[PDB]
Amino acid sequence: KLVIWINGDKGYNGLAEVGKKFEKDTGIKVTVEHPDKLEEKFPQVAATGDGPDIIFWAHDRFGGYAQSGLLAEITPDKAFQDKLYPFTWDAVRYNGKLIAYPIAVEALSLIYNKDLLPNPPKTWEEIPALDKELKAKGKSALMFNLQEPYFTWPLIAADGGYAFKYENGKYDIKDVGVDNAGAKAGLTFLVDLIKNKHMNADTDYSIAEAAFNKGETAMTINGPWAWSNIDTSKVNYGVTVLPTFKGQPSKPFVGVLSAGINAASPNKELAKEFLENYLLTDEGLEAVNKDKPLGAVALKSYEEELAKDPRIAATMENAQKGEIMPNIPQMSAFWYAVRTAVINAASGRQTVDEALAAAQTHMDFSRNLYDIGEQLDSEDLASLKFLSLDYIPQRKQEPIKDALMLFQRLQEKRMLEESNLSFLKELLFRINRLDLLITYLNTRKEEMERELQTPGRAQISAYRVMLYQISEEVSRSELRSFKGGLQEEISKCKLDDDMNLLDIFIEMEKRVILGEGKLDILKRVCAQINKSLLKIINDYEEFS
């Protein structure tokens, strides 16, 4: 029994129809579904072992699923792999191994106004001279969305800008630019167009779609989604290849709709030939495309069929000259760094060296939090969560799952930021990870030792540091003493063999028997286990 997931805005019951062609040769029927918000809830149900058999989604997300081993690696015959364009397999790889089947391909194209503009420029540089023309009778040359990088990245990446370097089958989180002479050359030309009036600088997505669909602008930059609302706009248009900057093709981000196979699925065996020899023919794709258009498709066979649409032939051409969008989670910092970096460069608020060098350092900063959290094993997380309790509500500490999430929660409450490492440095120092402090933060041990005597500099309250140092000198068996040497006392507790001594302190604060000035209970139970646990209390209680 095959079960397919796919979004509602797709041709899902055209997919349900190749699935009924399939069952009359098989008996095994498939039931396509469009669960609401399926991208978010597939990780949740697959770790239970219940996700559909096949999952249809954009490729960028499939990386996170594979990072958690939620998609098994497919095994297509190599003679099959040639049935599709070469680049579409670079989008379905993690650790170099193939993960999903490419289905469709999406990219931005140049969309012009044939009545207004009979011939499109081959070239970005032709446009200032051109906008000067149409300006002479109250119409702009180009108007497109400048509020997101996805629309401004093609010009920026043209001269050699890239997000992450894809080489020999996998990405390098270390190499990213964004701060190279290509990204600078493309952004300066963008910044100046605005500087010169050839583009108003608050042109959002809908302002541009207004100007174009009303014949106020010669051309725009958009994708196959905006085709519907300009077909009804009643303006004669065409879409072709984006102009060339510095003699080099504009590189838009390419999205690949892909079908992945669930790792915890009985039917991987049979899900393959459903995709290879029924869905991915001219027959299965024209079925889904006759429902709702797949845009341009990855299968070479049916693509040429669709290419006699001048529009599908163009979104395909830009896709080839384009940049396959990386499917790794470090890309969430890319959109922030670059969106804020074009918004400040184009407004005049920053230099393009200033803006882009700032974008670079934000990526180095977000990558460093990754590299740090990857060295923090699960016990260090329990320690870091207890030390962070003063400032992060443990309410929202149900969703906290790994060290990186703790770091992101701190960015939220603006105690960890690009310019303020002081709390993170103190956290690692408290939990005695001096190897990470030198390696990723350039901080000697004496320097932290000597940062925290300076008054009002240490943030973690000594009451927190006192309790953590006590949980450090208490073993599993020394804790079985604490557990039953406070049941001797009043409860004031549901305890159990699942709670470490730190979970006992939180649960004593929670009963208000252990506080910044409530230590009688604590001072007794420690004197019965290890006496020198008592001395830690007295030294803290010497400082007030």
Task: Give yes or no for a contact between 430 and 409, defined as CB atoms under 8 angstroms apart.
Answer: no
The single residue listed with the structure tokens 């992450």 is: 164
> Which tokens hold the place of 465?
């540091």
Looking at residue 454, the DSSP 8-state letter turns out to be S
H-assigned helices in 106-148: 126-134
> Which tokens hold the place of 30?
């498939």
> Which tokens hold the place of 307?
């290419």
Please provide residue 317's backbone torsions phi and psi, each rounded to the nearest 5 degrees: -65, -45
The span from the CA of 22 to the CA of 28, in Å, is: 8
Task: Give yes or no for a contact between 217 and 140, defined as CB atoms under 8 angstroms apart.
Answer: yes
233 burial level (CB within 10 Å; 0-12, 13-18, 19+): middle
On whether both 89 and 9 belong to a single domain, the answer is yes
> Which tokens hold the place of 266?
């009985």
| Residue 35 resides in a domain | yes
> Which tokens hold the place of 180?
């190279």
Task: Give yes or no for a contact between 113 and 212, defined as CB atoms under 8 angstroms apart.
Answer: yes
On whether both 468 and 442 belong to a single domain, the answer is no
| Residue 430 resides in a domain | yes
The span from the CA of 168 to the CA of 177, in Å, is: 18
Residue 441 belongs to domain with CATH number: 1.10.533.10
**Residue that finishes a domain, picked among 365, 393, 418:** 365
The span from the CA of 154 to the CA of 160, in Å, is: 10
Bridge pairing between strands 237-240 and 30-33 = unpaired
On whether both 336 and 300 belong to a single domain, the answer is no
* Strand, helix or coil for residue 118: coil
**Residues 264-267: contacts with CB under 8 Å, at least 24 apart:** 264/46, 264/49, 264/50, 264/51, 264/70, 265/51, 265/53, 265/72, 266/53, 267/1, 267/2, 267/28, 267/53
On whether both 504 and 453 belong to a single domain, the answer is no
Q: Per residue, what are the HEC states of 94-105?
A: ECCEECEEEEEE
Q: What is the DSSP string of 47-88?
A: TTT-S-SEEEEEHHHHHHHHHTT-B------HHHHTTB-GGG
- The dihedral built from the CA positions of residue 332, 333, 334 and 339, taken in this order, carries a sign that is positive
The span from the CA of 21 to the CA of 23, in Å, is: 6
On whether both 175 and 70 belong to a single domain, the answer is no
206 burial level (CB within 10 Å; 0-12, 13-18, 19+): exposed
> Which tokens hold the place of 24?
């009359």
On whether both 78 and 226 belong to a single domain, the answer is no
Residue 313 belongs to domain with CATH number: 3.40.190.10
The single residue listed with the structure tokens 């370097």 is: 165
Looking at residue 120, the DSSP 8-state letter turns out to be -
* Closest residue by Cα to residue 424 from 463, 382, 379, 368: 368
**Residue that finishes a domain, picked among 460, 475, 490:** 460
User: How many structural domains are present in the chain?
Assistant: 4
* Closest residue by Cα to residue 92 from 83, 110, 104: 104
| Residue 410 resides in a domain | yes
Q: Per residue, what are the HEC states of 271-318?
A: HHHHHHHHHCCHHHHHHHHHHCCCCEECEHHHHHHHHCCCCHHHHHHH
How far lies 105's CA from each of 85, 108, 243, 422, 527, in Å? 10, 11, 20, 45, 69
- How far is C-alpha 390 from the chain's CA centre? 29
| Residue 371 resides in a domain | no
Proportion of the chain in helix, strand, coil states, percent, rounded to 5: 50, 15, 35
> Which tokens hold the place of 208?
């541009």
On whether both 474 and 498 belong to a single domain, the answer is yes
| Residue 510 resides in a domain | yes
The single residue listed with the structure tokens 């096949």 is: 54
On whether both 267 and 171 belong to a single domain, the answer is no
30 burial level (CB within 10 Å; 0-12, 13-18, 19+): buried
The span from the CA of 327 to the CA of 91, in Å, is: 8
Amino acid at 182: G
On whether both 456 and 473 belong to a single domain, the answer is no
* Closest residue by Cα to residue 341 from 112, 176, 476: 176
Task: Give yes or no for a contact between 216 and 140, defined as CB atoms under 8 angstroms apart.
Answer: yes
| Residue 385 resides in a domain | yes
On whether both 101 and 120 belong to a single domain, the answer is no
Q: What is the DSSP string of 198-251?
A: SS-TT--HHHHHHHHHTTSEEEEEE-GGGHHHHHTTT--EEEEPPPEETTEE--
The single residue listed with the structure tokens 């997000």 is: 163
Q: Radius of gyration over alpha carbons of the chain, in Å? A: 29
Strand partners, 245: 248
| Residue 477 resides in a domain | yes
On whether both 48 and 194 belong to a single domain, the answer is no
503 burial level (CB within 10 Å; 0-12, 13-18, 19+): middle
| Residue 370 resides in a domain | no
* Closest residue by Cα to residue 118 from 212, 233, 236, 234: 236
* Closest residue by Cα to residue 298 from 114, 128, 76: 76
On whether both 224 and 139 belong to a single domain, the answer is yes
Whole domain around residue 402: which residue ranges? 376-460
